Structure 1
Amino acid sequence: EEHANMQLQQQAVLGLNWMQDSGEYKALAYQAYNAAKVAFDHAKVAKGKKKAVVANLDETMLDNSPYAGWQVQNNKPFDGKDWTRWVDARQSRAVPGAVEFNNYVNSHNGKVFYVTNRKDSTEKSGTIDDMKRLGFNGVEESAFYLKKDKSAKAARFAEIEKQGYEIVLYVGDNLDDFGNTVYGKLNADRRAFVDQNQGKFGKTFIMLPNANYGGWEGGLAEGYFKKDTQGQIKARLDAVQAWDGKL
């Protein structure tokens, strides 16, 4: 139903305004990348290891908000086929602070590896072109670990380590950017992971804000991503914790 599609996408509007328009969002991005530089500079690795930083792309280093805007204007739920066209459109922007941090790491005895669920086979060319255009250094193909057969990221982290790197910090907008332990899990388990790692945030796990999509959306209800539009609307509304209006 068109009505259901409109309701689902309208629910994203205020958070999208915040991410696209607010100074507050920019300030959070700068805060993250300022903290990331401090962590990188402090990091020491085992003898014989090279220093690596693992960075997520979408909503961490790359800003895809115009795709979300298109969803709002056209009442379009997320669809990977539309996403591939967005990537091919080569209109990605950079998250504030990301290029400077990336280039700093790469010029100070580190290497940033991009572990990203953009698709290796269909979305690589647009990604690399946009990143070159946006000013990122170190965007040769071998810096990228794009999605092949698995959306969970830990195996790609292990590939990086096998190449003689020690990962000194991770940058992401989704807890699944830090490992697999809450991949596919609901939000209670995801919050528990965060509590169990409280001291790592702003140190070895660097967070960017994303109020628009992610593992937390699927985390709203069992089987969320397989539900129809009406089911997803209901899952979102049922997750709301509301004051009852009484004293």
Structure 2
Amino acid sequence: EHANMQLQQQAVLGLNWMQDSGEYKALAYQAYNAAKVAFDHAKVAKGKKKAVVADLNETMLDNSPYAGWQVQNNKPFDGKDWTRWVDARQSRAVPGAVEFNNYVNSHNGKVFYVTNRKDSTEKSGTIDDMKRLGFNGVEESAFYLKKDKSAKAARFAEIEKQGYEIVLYVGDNLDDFGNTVYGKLNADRRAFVDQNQGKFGKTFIMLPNANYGGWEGGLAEGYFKKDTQGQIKARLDAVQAWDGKL
């Protein structure tokens, strides 16, 4: 129980930032302002329909109250708890997301939700929240929720097989742009970003998430297979510190 409190306390400052700061809101607006510009500029091959692919969690939907519950109950992430959160139907919208979504859908485009919320158990709550939140276009066929694989490239391909050309991707996780660094450590993930420097803010649109993600598992080999104590040490070992001298 000591390790659990320590692990979740380490998330507090970043959670305050995501939940309370105007700075976070500004970053969300910045991403979606850029996304609209990219969508408007996009041209697709003859015969293709324009598609935008968007992740949900921490991209279009704000699940910060779940993180707040982890902090307050010293609870590390558990898929069983997550499913209850989804069923709770208290998701909020990331600033600018609804407007951008609805703009795309009313301007000769279609947003597809490629998300790792679970198709079997988490679909009903997701669709309910998004309708309440004001998203247009949330019929079941717009959703590619998780079934067998967490990697998303196969779903992107399903979308292209339906006659769409994907003009841009929106996400908070690099794995939202393809599979090339799925399950990889942060060194490789940073290298992927470097190799794609010019796409960010154009065809790859980023939202900030300092609370969780592929970068967490990226902190150390077999991070998620570690116990709570091992994860704390992984985080602290990853820290780069000034030695305090000149």
**Percent identity, aligned pairs only?**
99
Instruction: Report the Cα offset of residue 244 of structure 1.
Output: 0.2
Instruction: Report the Cα offset of residue 109 of structure 1.
Output: 0.1
Aligned equivalents of 2:127 and 2:169: distance in 1? 20
Instruction: Report the Cα offset of residue 162 of structure 1.
Output: 0.2
Instruction: Report the Cα offset of residue 185 of structure 1.
Output: 0.1
Q: Which residue of 2 aligns with 1:116?
A: 115
- Per-residue CA deviations over 1:84-139 (Å, capped at 9, x if unaligned) read 00000000000000000000000000000000000000000000000000000000
Instruction: Report the Cα offset of residue 226 of structure 1.
Output: 0.5
Q: TM-score, normalised by structure 2?
A: 1.00
Aligned: 1:197 with 2:184: no
Instruction: Report the Cα offset of residue 53 of structure 1.
Output: 0.0
Aligned equivalents of 1:77 and 1:15: distance in 2? 16
- Per-residue CA deviations over 1:58-108 (Å, capped at 9, x if unaligned) read 000000000000000000000000000000000000000000000000000
Aligned equivalents of 1:226 and 1:132: distance in 2? 36
- Per-residue CA deviations over 1:190-241 (Å, capped at 9, x if unaligned) read 0000000000000000000000000000000000000000000000000000
Instruction: Report the Cα offset of residue 22 of structure 1.
Output: 0.1
User: Secondary structure of 2:69's match?
Assistant: helix
User: Secondary structure of 1:18's match?
Assistant: helix
Aligned equivalents of 2:58 and 2:225: distance in 1? 23
User: Secondary structure of 1:36's match?
Assistant: helix
The runs of at least 4 aligned residues of structure 1 exceeding 2 Å deviation read none
Q: Which residue of 2 aligns with 1:102?
A: 101
Q: TM-score, normalised by structure 1?
A: 1.00
Q: Which residue of 2 aligns with 1:215?
A: 214
| Number of equivalences | 246
* 1:3-42 to 2 correspondences below 5 Å: 3-42=2-41
User: Secondary structure of 1:231's match?
Assistant: helix
User: Secondary structure of 1:222's match?
Assistant: coil
Gaps of at least 5 residues in structure 2 are none
User: Secondary structure of 2:168's match?
Assistant: strand
- Calculate the aligned-residue CA RMSD, in Å: 0.1
Instruction: Report the Cα offset of residue 157 of structure 1.
Output: 0.1
Instruction: Report the Cα offset of residue 173 of structure 1.
Output: 0.1
User: Secondary structure of 2:151's match?
Assistant: coil
* 1:1-247 to 2 correspondences below 5 Å: 2-247=1-246
Aligned equivalents of 1:246 and 1:200: distance in 2? 39
Gaps of at least 5 residues in structure 1 are none
User: Secondary structure of 1:206's match?
Assistant: strand
